Paper text:
The Tol-Pal system is essential for maintaining outer membrane (OM) stability during cell division in Gram-negative bacteria. The inner membrane complex TolQRA harnesses proton motive force (PMF) to establish transient interactions within the periplasm, thereby coordinating cell envelope remodeling and facilitating OM invagination at division sites. TolQ forms a pentameric structure similar to that of MotA and ExbB, exhibiting a volcano-like configuration with a narrow periplasmic end and a wider cytoplasmic base. The pentameric TolQ encapsulates the dimeric TolR through its N-terminal transmembrane helices at the periplasmic end.
To address this, we co-expressed TolQR and TolA from Escherichia coli (strain K12), purified, and determined the structure of the TolQRA complex reconstituted in phospholipid nanodiscs by cryo-EM. The transmembrane portion of the complex, including TolQ and the transmembrane helices of TolR and TolA, is well resolved at 3.52 Å resolution. Densities for the periplasmic domains of TolA and TolR were obtained at lower resolution due to inherent flexibility. These regions were subsequently modeled through AlphaFold3 prediction. In the TolQRA nanodisc complex, we identified three major reconstructions showing up to three TolA molecules associated with TolQ subunits TolQ1, TolQ3, and TolQ4, respectively. TolA interacts with TolQ through their transmembrane helices (TolA_I) in a crossing configuration, stabilized by hydrogen bonds between TolQ_I29 and TolA_S18, TolQ_S28 and TolA_H22, and TolQ_N5 and TolA_S33. While D23 from TolR chain A (TolR(A)_D23) points toward the interface between TolQ2 and TolQ3, TolR(B)_D23 forms hydrogen bonds with T145 and T178 of TolQ5. When viewed from the cytoplasmic side of the pentamer, TolQ5R2A3 features an oval-shaped cytoplasmic opening, TolQ5R2 presents a round opening, and TolQ5R2A displays a split between TolQ1 and TolQ5 as well as between TolQ3 and TolQ4. In the cryo-EM map, we also observed a satellite periplasmic density located ~60 Å above TolQ5 and TolQ1, which likely corresponds to the periplasmic domains of TolR (TolR_PDs). A segment of this TolA1_loop is resolved in the cryo-EM map, protruding into the periplasmic space from the interface between helices 1 of TolQ1 and TolQ5, aligning with the TolR_PDs.
Numbering used by the authors:
A (entry chain E), B (entry chain A), C (entry chain B), D (entry chain C), E (entry chain D): 5 to 221
F (entry chain F), G (entry chain G): 14 to 37
H (entry chain H), I (entry chain J), J (entry chain I): 7 to 35
Write the structure that this text describes.
Amino acid sequence: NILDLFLKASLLVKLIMLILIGFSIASWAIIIQRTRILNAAAREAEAFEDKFWSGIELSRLYQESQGKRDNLTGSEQIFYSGFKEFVRLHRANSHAPEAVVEGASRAMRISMNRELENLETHIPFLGTVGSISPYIGLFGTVWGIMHAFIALGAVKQATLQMVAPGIAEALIATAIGLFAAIPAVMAYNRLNQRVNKLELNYDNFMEEFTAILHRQA
Amino acid sequence: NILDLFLKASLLVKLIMLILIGFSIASWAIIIQRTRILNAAAREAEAFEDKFWSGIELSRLYQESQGKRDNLTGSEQIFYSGFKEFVRLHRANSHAPEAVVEGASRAMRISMNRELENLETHIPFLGTVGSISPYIGLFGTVWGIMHAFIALGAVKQATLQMVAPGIAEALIATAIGLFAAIPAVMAYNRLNQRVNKLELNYDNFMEEFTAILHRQA
Amino acid sequence: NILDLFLKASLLVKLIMLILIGFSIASWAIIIQRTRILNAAAREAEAFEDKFWSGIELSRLYQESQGKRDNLTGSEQIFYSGFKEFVRLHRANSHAPEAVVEGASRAMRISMNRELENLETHIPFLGTVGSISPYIGLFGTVWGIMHAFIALGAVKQATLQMVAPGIAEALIATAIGLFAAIPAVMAYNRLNQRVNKLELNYDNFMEEFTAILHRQA
Amino acid sequence: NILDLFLKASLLVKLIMLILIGFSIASWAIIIQRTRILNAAAREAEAFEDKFWSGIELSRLYQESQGKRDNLTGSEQIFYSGFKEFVRLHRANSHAPEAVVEGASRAMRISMNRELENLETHIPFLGTVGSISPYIGLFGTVWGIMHAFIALGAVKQATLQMVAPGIAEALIATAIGLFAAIPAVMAYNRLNQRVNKLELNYDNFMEEFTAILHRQA
Amino acid sequence: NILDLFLKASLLVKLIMLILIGFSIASWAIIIQRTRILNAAAREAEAFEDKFWSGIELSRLYQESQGKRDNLTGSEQIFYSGFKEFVRLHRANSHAPEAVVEGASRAMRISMNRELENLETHIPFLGTVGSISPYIGLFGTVWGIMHAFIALGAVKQATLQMVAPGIAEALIATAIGLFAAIPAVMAYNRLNQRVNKLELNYDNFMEEFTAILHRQA
Amino acid sequence: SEINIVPLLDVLLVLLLIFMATAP
Amino acid sequence: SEINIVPLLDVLLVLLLIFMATAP
Amino acid sequence: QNDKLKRAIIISAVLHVILFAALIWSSFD
Amino acid sequence: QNDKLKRAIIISAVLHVILFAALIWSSFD
Amino acid sequence: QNDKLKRAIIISAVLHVILFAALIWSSFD
């Protein structure tokens, strides 16, 4: 039934349907794949932050971090970069305390920016899809209405078959356009507010680490 | 008439109606549940705010909190965690005053975040329902009208009178969706405003107690 | 004419019209009320900001404010709260400049927050009205069309001229809904823009006063 | 002719058409008036910015600036106000060197705010017109369409010869609305962009002049 | 028979269609050209950020930059101009340190402004197309329908088949309008976001480099 | 940067009136 | 708080299609 | 505060009544 | 990441095929 | 970037011309 109407429609309507189907598939895949990464990042951040406040010497933590340096991710890399820069600056030329503090701060900022860039991917695509999804369906419906009006212009009296294709193609276009827009709308804000709360934890950790480093030198 | 509607409706039409009815029931239940919890939390917060400024020494308040034992919510939990962490850190005599103050602040921050997370449950479902509900109804209406038009062509004795009952039943889908979506936005806004109101009181109490604890150090 | 159509309407349509009219009246009343208060607050803040920097000793200004011995509004309240906190905090407890500065700043922040809260009432109602209003009109339109189509099938004669009035009722409902909706949607942003600027001015004044107090410690 | 259609129209349509024509005329006048001022301000600012860094002593620049004091604008006015406040505070009172810099900064900020306010006149009206006109056109069309439906409800055997003038009159309102709404949207963004690009020069000049004043204080 | 419809249409419809086709053709190339430039700039900035903090002395970096002459772009031009003017002012006799620092800072600001102006070319044109395109199509459709009814009014008695071809020819403009409107709206936001993300890095680098050079003198 | 298709309701109502007018 | 117009357009288009289908 | 709100409510109500009365009259013509 | 993208694409394609089959079956009833 | 801009303009123009010609030719059929 639906396949009959889809085949009977022109090529432009079929292209629009294919584009909408592709957008739906991509949106579903991205929504599926983002949540696991976000949850894993949150769990790793909490787990690492648990061990930092246990009273263990920072030197032992730095030594342990070297063993898995190439696979560091999350909140652990910021501490690694900051401590490496601090120790390198302190061991060389006996720099002023402000210099080493600023070096640690810049290293932490760069690492945090890189991590946040890694976390946030393909999120704006969902918003764009949700925003611009129905207007393509409106384009298809307008073309179907035009075809129906052209069919109605025959000299003979109109019949059901003459106006059948336009109505069917317009209805199918509207239905697919409406169907393609739900998941992006339902997921965009929930995905954005997820990162908006990890940013605050990273900022708080950076402030605490800098404050702790201030007293040492 | 509900049984008649279900009997006359085909698949992908009664499922949507059941989903919408379930969403309406769930939204009403969630609202009714959450109003009382928020009111009780506000009253308890006001009561403990009144208690604290009575001039009683902090130690006596600590034995009172210990007498309360496990059942603690909000400000009581924050105060208990802060004092416990402060005493545990101070008894060690292995940290500077700034270190023990920071350690005391961290526990209060964690407890406040946990309490807010406990209070803020089930809110996003209302937003999802309010955002999603109309489009499902529109999809159902479009599908029903498509089926009604398709079934018409089979019988060549069609009349404009006999299609009115078929057309009328299709539009029931969107009305249910709008009726479900109407109260969700208002409930969402009011609950979010109340939570935002509580957050400021929690933050102010945390800062004041941190300053007071630092004074004795 | 139109009055006859309104008289011949059903109960739900009339109730919807009454609700929309009430919402419009309330929104207009709030919009008319808030602007004068905002303008008065702006000019009062500017006047006292100008009075501060004339060069008169701060003690004389505090003496005049205490002699007023009444509730104040705007930048006057912040100065009074800060000076009153400073007077007691300087002699008592720790004489370190940092403690006194932080103690004064906390009181200034509390006063700013309470004034901002007192200046921002009844605003979210406009936003929720703007968000909710169109759906009620759409509900009325759908109900009217449904009843019009249901009534048609009960007679043997099928003429669209018999169906004509229901479309007019639905269009009236939709027009009333949009007319109620638009102005609040505009006024929400138009009013938030002013509160942002007032907050910025208060923050700048707080920074300047904190620096002035700190430099004499 | 169009004049005949205007004459045969009722009061509401005539009022709507007059309002739309007035909006078009006002929009054109505002655009033409504002373009020249925004063009001249940038040239004057660039000329004074080039002149300032020539290395001439500031006292000579201040002395020369008093010749055309009533006609100064932009960075010249900012510099004049800052220098006047600085010299008045320094030679009229004996205080710490930081207070004079703070007062000069406040005076410069107030002058910059006044200059921006004078530069940003009459802009939001274009945005209001662009956001309002289509709705007015839609209401004007819906009124006539509803009246035509009411008239057709009672009559029988319509031949499409009685309702043609109604459609002909309704379409002109929408055409005029679109014509009025077209240019305001394109003018608004460009004017806002020019103002935003102009603000940064004043900000940078204020920062540089404060830094310069600090050293010689 | 799209070509037949295009040839049959009046002068204004053909002019509007040609204008819309021109806008679409001009619009695609700008996006295609700008995406590559932004992508290249991102990786170049990342590479330079990687190289600078390796611990290499500044004189070696200046010697490397000397050979590349005008090929330097992005932050490399900023560093080149800043160090050049710093050296030029330092070798001059009787120099205050802060004056030299400010002289370097102004050159850095000028270079960054020039780089941003070069990078942000032709972007604002897309927004105008995206905001104006549909209105022209709607105006054309309204004009076409109006003249269709004007031609219909010549014969007072006519059926739907007399006017049906006219309406179908009119609706061509809106489809082309939407077709030209969609991609610019899709691309403008992403381009703006990339530009802002690139600007923030230059701001941070300038701040850090200005901070570092202060301790050199 | 969005798409405004508000005036399209005008054309829809105008076209809808035609079919009702020529019903008999 | 922004005005959502898509549902109204969809309902109007559905009604127009229903009216058009009944022409013959 | 409350008195100003009541006055604004009354003004809005009378303005709306006047507007509706004007709209109804135009229907008879 | 690329392997995760491939897995997500495969899962989405399977789900879409199942949904299309269910829609076709429901169209008959 | 000016030569690249001209190349992009030419490519867009020829692609649009080819696509429109194909659409028009298929429209008659």
